[PDB]
């Protein structure tokens, strides 16, 4: 990405990063999905 | 809706045509299959030896336009795959060699009205990754919400006036992110049709 | 992550596989600090 | 009109046929889920609250007896029942009695509303552990009490007598509805049902057509 | 829209958390194939050992909370059949023996986060016609129209506290009244989801 | 009276917890006999996995808080000896060996609960002379005039926002100038015991 790039540069940071999804499937298809986000002192979860 | 290129209205500030020029023009439909891999273009090289502006850019050596895009691509609803529109200011492709030193020589770096076709896509046939491709204007053609993208462009250089058969203002492309499917029964062709129409053409000197 | 709530569901002859692309930027209150160069791989 | 609630139950019915032999007692469990014309007509609703009001009936074999001071008694929701025709629970201050010839006309007596929780529950749905004062489903707010008949006599009574209780609501307010009972129950106090062998609802017919 | 039940707004009149316990909950994701017979789940049992409210029932003996339902099942336009979406207070089941006494037991009646799975559905378990089962708060989920139903209950008990592990105050049912039915070349299972929010929590007791 | 540290009142400019954390807490009566030497605590440590506050830093990793203390200690007027107490903000020990280099590991340098022991007083077990060591926050109980010391400490510490369990803020200490005398015929522990009350907790982050 470009964010990934030039802090390549510039040792230190801080702020708030966000991400985006958007799909390319069918018009016909339809479900669902559960974006998650842990906070940083555990590792990725188990189950559901 | 439409998505100007740096949020500036082309205008201009030497002879002036009028609206025999702001007829929309209409390239050829290309043909988006299963496996194919990109299309680019450079303006305002294909429109000439075309029409009535190709009579005006053939033989005055001065030339100042801003243009307007409509790219649209025919799909049903049971086909996927979404498609990119990006707007490159000073397009430069270099050859694939490693030495000497292999030009691309003429018969691929202005195509004209027939555009050409990328070899090699993740990189932009330019050392550029495509991650990284959307600083520029771009736009999502996505087959399964819209199917129209609308892009003006004002005039980009530093001169204030070129000529219009050697230097190239900018270039248009045109890559499949997503890759084509389909069940079987339907068509195997999505058309990809353009539209090109100049804005305020201004031209200068004779013969 | 991104954990699957429900199994994909299509009506027939439509193909049964999409793809998810991702985006990614910064918003404004995105700092920086000490000037550093970066790690490239040819040197000239 | 005559559509509302209160007339709806208001008529008075039999509950239960208390006999005695001389034991010299017969007791007997308030217990309004008797019969099952009065079941199936009060599980319609889910909560009610009422008061009741009995109406005892004395008839000796044969029919009719010179006089004797039977009596009935009533035992509150948490005290002890009695054992004996002699016992000490027959001459405690809390167990409201009533003293009736045979001759006389029928004994009427009244009862108040006997419960801690504010209305009764005819459905229950838990395990009265740590609960209100195998296990499904039973709840100890709806008892009522007992009545124990007794005639009164030092010895040798003999007369084979035979008791009737009739059952009339009052004042009786209901809440929210459910839907009626069709599959004819086979345990008192559950809603089992022999799930081999389904009753239909509807008698058959030809087919779909000729109606 | 929404449906309230029996027509009352849920409020209260002890500790009182706040919006901590107001985020929304997701139970399992079912499957409701071509030959399933319905499933039930007995609320607000399945809102123990999870979650935050989990540690406020576990540890809290008396309770009071309305809640706030949202049931949807997504299935395109090629599929057909109808659900039923209702919500009995006060949900007795009974043993299916004949005779001594076959209870239930306890791992039938009080099923968890995993819902059970009606025996016999045409007499909803409980010796009541399913004719007659629309006294009670319905809302007809039907695959040609509408996938979403939103039933909003107060809580409904005599005495105005009880404990929240013995006690259970109401159960919701969902059954397939018209079986599911697919031409070949599909998908076999259309999933069901179930969303629940409880609205204005008061706990109280310690330990 | 109470005294302050360094004259500031504990407030605070993420998530905030009331009264439910502003209860007491209580740890455990030590025994203070004829020849020991000294304990330590390193606060916020000994509030972990105890309590409604265990569960709010154990899974928080943001933290800020400051404390209220109150030491003391019964004994009745034939007994003699002062103790001290004072509260220091980073409190550092370092193993006591020459050289190789060894530290003193986990179990000393973070005692829970348990306070630990000193092992050499004179010089705190930091190089430290203790007859300078009045330039913190102290206060002299002294069983003859008074027997108890009731010090505020706010939050001190360079980044406005720390975790719980790597780092602590300060510690507090406890040692006996005098040593304990009396005559025969009397008890001879004479208990000291503790009380913590968070004032502000104002925590941030999730699991």
Same mark, same amino acid.
């Given at each position: 990405t470009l964010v990934g790039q030039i802090c390549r540069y510039y040792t230190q940071w801080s702020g708030s990063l966000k991400v985006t999804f958007m799909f390319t499937g069918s018009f016909m298809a339809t479900g669902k999905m559960l974006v998650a986000y842990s906070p940083p002192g555990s590792a990725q979860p188990a189950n559901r | 809706n439409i998505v100007l290129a740096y949020g500036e209205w082309p205008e201009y500030c030497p002879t002036r045509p009028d609206v025999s020029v702001n007829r929309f023009y209409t390239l050829d439909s290309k043909m988006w299959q299963e496996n194919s891999t990109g299309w680019y273009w450079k303006f $305002?090289?294909?429109? +000439?030896? *075309?029409?009535v502006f190709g009579q005006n850019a053939q033989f005055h050596y001065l030339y100042r336009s801003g243009f307007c895009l409509h790219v649209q691509c025919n799909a049903s609803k049971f086909h996927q795959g979404a498609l990119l529109v990006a707007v490159i200011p000073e397009f430069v492709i270099a050859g694939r060699g490693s030495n000497e030193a292999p030009h691309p020589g003429f018969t691929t770096t202005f195509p004209g009205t027939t555009g050409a076709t990328f070899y090699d896509p993740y990189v932009l046939?330019?050392?550029? $990754?495509?991650? !990284? @491709?959307?600083?520029? $204007?771009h736009q999502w053609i996505n087959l399964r919400t819209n199917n129209c993208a609308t892009v003006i462009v004002p005039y980009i250089n530093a001169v204030p006036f070129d000529s @219009?058969?050697?230097? &190239? +203002?900018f270039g248009l492309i045109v890559i499949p992110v997503s890759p084509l499917k389909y069940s079987s029964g339907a068509t195997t062709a999505i058309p990809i049709t353009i539209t090109i129409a100049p804005l305020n053409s201004e031209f200068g000197g004779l013969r | 992550t991104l954990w699957y709530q429900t199994n994909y569901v299509v009506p027939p002859e439509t193909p049964g596989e999409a793809y998810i692309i991702a985006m990614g930027a910064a918003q404004d209150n995105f700092t920086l600090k000490i000037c550093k160069d970066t790690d490239e791989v040819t040197q000239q | 009109l005559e559509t509302t609630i209160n007339h709806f139950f208001s008529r008075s019915g039999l509950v239960g046929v208390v006999n005695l032999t001389d034991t010299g007692y017969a007791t007997w469990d308030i217990d309004?889920?008797?019969?099952?014309q009065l079941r199936r007509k009060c599980e319609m609703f889910t909560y009610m609250r009422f008061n009741a009001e009995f109406t005892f009936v004395t008839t000796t074999e044969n029919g009719g007896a010179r006089p004797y001071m039977l009596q009935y008694m009533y035992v509150p929701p948490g005290a002890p029942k009695p054992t004996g025709?002699? #016992?000490? !629970?027959? !001459? *405690? #201050? *809390?167990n409201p009695s009533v003293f009736v010839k045979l001759t006389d006309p029928p004994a009427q007596v009244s009862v108040p509303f006997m419960s801690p929780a504010s209305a009764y529950q005819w459905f229950y749905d838990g395990y009265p552990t740590f609960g209100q004062h195998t296990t499904y489903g039973?709840?100890? +707010?709806n008892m009522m009490g007992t009545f124990a008949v007794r005639v009164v006599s030092?010895? @040798? &009574? !003999?007369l084979k007598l035979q008791t009737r209780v009739y059952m009339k609501l009052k004042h009786v307010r209901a809440w929210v509805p459910r839907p009626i009972r069709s599959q004819p129950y086979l345990l008192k106090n559950f809603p089992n049902y022999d799930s081999s062998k389904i009753t239909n609802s509807a008698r058959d017919r030809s087919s779909i057509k000729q109606a």
């Open positions: - | $305002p090289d294909v429109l +000439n030896k *075309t029409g046939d330019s050392g550029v $990754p495509l991650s !990284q @491709a959307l600083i520029y $204007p @219009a058969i050697n230097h &190239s +203002n | - | 309004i889920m008797g019969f099952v025709r002699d #016992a000490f !629970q027959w !001459q *405690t #201050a *809390t039973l709840c100890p +707010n030092r010895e @040798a &009574s !003999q």
